[PDB]
Amino acid sequence: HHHHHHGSATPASAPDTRALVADFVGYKLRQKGYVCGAGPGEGPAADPLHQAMRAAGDEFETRFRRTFSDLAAQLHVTPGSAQQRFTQVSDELFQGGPNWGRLVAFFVFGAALCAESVNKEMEVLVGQVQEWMVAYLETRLADWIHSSGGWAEFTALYGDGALE
Amino acid sequence: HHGSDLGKKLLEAANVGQHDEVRILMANGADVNAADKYGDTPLHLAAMNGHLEIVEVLLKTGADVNAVDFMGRTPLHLAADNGHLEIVEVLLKHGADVNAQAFWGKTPLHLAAQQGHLEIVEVLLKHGADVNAQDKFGKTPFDLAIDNGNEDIAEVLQKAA
């Protein structure tokens, strides 16, 4: 007796991408000492995809420790130029085409840009960069992600498994 | 797979500086140019982590001195960035590309200048490092030295132009 509502499209909707980006960025901001307390990324990951990205980003950053943090610090960013600079770095990262490694690099860079923004007293940019990441993933990178097996494939490759 | 497994072990032994183990694995048939998930070879990892003796034996046994990892780094980038002078010298002796560009156009001279490694800057310069090389910001190694308050290096780069 509860009848389904066949809703029309909501183009701006992207709940899973938003949650993933928010978790990773929040996790990284707390890890780097820029954010404290409750919110996305606080405590253990509550989704295997989120855990997979945390682990992948962590491992990448251990190997390329200052690659993106140096870039984010050196990049000239104001609130007015931030989207242009975000787009510049992202477009360079994906020269040669997407792959899972480049996706991880993209997340690491996005988090690094957010951290530097907090450091430079531009915390307002954090939420904005998250949304720019979401739009870039939902539009520029979506076809590749789908054709490559979706985020479920990423979780299989980078996650810690069904026991954990 | 046996061979792939030997490569994995060689990468790890080079990474943590286990010199005897590196030699044993090479004798077992490990590929000296095995690469890990980040495109790093044993030479990359040994160069990055300051393991000079391992760097030497890898080069003597056919390691690619100019191998490139996922972010465009060569062993020379890694030794230069991390301040390993002796390793920088041996890599250059073995034909390392002194002006190789990593991600964002970063050369070894950019990184040595940024990190304050004066002696490394000097050896890079002796081997033809390009003082005018611009990264994708337009920065030269001099600019990075200035940005990081390394005026002795900045002076050296200034007089080397």
UniProtKB/Swiss-Prot annotation, chain A:
BH2, short sequence motif: residues: 143-158
Keyword Acetylation: yes
Domain of life where this protein originates: Eukaryota
Membrane topology label: Peripheral membrane protein
Modified residues (N-acetylalanine): A9
Family under the similarity heading: Belongs to the Bcl-2 family.
Disulphide bond pairs: none
Subcellular location: Mitochondrion membrane
Alphabetical UniProt keywords: Acetylation, Apoptosis, Membrane, Mitochondrion
Annotated GO biological process: extrinsic apoptotic signaling pathway in absence of ligand; intrinsic apoptotic signaling pathway in response to DNA damage; positive regulation of apoptotic process; release of cytochrome c from mitochondria
Function noted in UniProt: Promotes cell survival. Blocks dexamethasone-induced apoptosis. Mediates survival of postmitotic Sertoli cells by suppressing death-promoting activity of BAX.
Organism: Bos taurus
Entry GO terms, CC: mitochondrial outer membrane
UniProt-recorded name of the protein: Bcl-2-like protein 2
Record text on subunit structure and interactions: Interacts with HIF3A (via C-terminus domain). Interacts with BOP.
Motif (BH4): 16-36
Chief localisation class: mitochondrion
Notes on the domains: The BH4 motif seems to be involved in the anti-apoptotic function.
